[PDB]
Amino acid sequence: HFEEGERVLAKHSDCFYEAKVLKVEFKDNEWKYFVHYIGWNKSWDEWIRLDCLLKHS
């Protein structure tokens, strides 16, 4: 659904932030995405699930 390198919106807590997908993995019948939040410390990088992601536009 999303690819390595892709600009996306990623939900953290209550709202969506500009982010970039760094890694994609599939395990236990589900996709997960390691995302970086644009402009933010790398310490906030995290694995999130598909329903936490939005394509732009």
Author numbering: 51 to 107
Would you copy out the relevant sentences from the publication that reported this structure?
Firstly, via their chromodomain, MRG1/2 proteins act as readers that recognize methylated H3K4 and H3K36.
H3K4me3 (residues 1–9) and H3K36me3 (residues 31–41) exhibited detectable binding to MRG2 chromodomain (residues 41–123) (Kd values: 0.8 mM for H3K4me3; 0.69 mM for H3K36me3). To obtain the information regarding the specific MRG2 residues that are important for recognition of the histone marks H3K4me3 and H3K36me3, we determined the co-crystal structure of MRG2 and the methylated H3 peptides. The proteolyzed samples were analyzed using mass spectrometry (MS) analysis to determine the protein sequence, resulting in the identification of a region containing the chromodomain with residues 53–123 of MRG2 as suitable for crystallization. MRG2 complexes with the H3K4me3 and H3K36me3 peptides were obtained, but the complexes with the H3K27me3 and H3K9me3 peptides could not form crystals under the same conditions, consistent with the ITC results. The crystals of MRG2 with H3K4me3 or H3K36me3 were diffracted to 1.68 and 1.65 Å, respectively. In both structures, the MRG2 chromodomain contains mainly four beta-strands. However, the predicted alpha-helix located at the C-terminus is missing in the electron density map. For the complexes of the MRG2 chromodomain with the H3K4me3/H3K36me3 peptides, the recognition modes are almost the same; therefore, only the complex of the MRG2 chromodomain with H3K36me3 peptide is shown in Figure 7A. The tri-methylated lysine projects into the aromatic cage formed by the His62, Tyr67, Tyr87, Trp90, and Trp94 residues of the MRG2 chromodomain. The co-crystal structures clearly indicate that the chromodomain of MRG2 can directly bind to tri-methylated H3K4 and H3K36, and provide strong evidence that the aromatic cage of the MRG2 chromodomain and the associated residues are essential for the binding, the same as other chromodomain proteins.
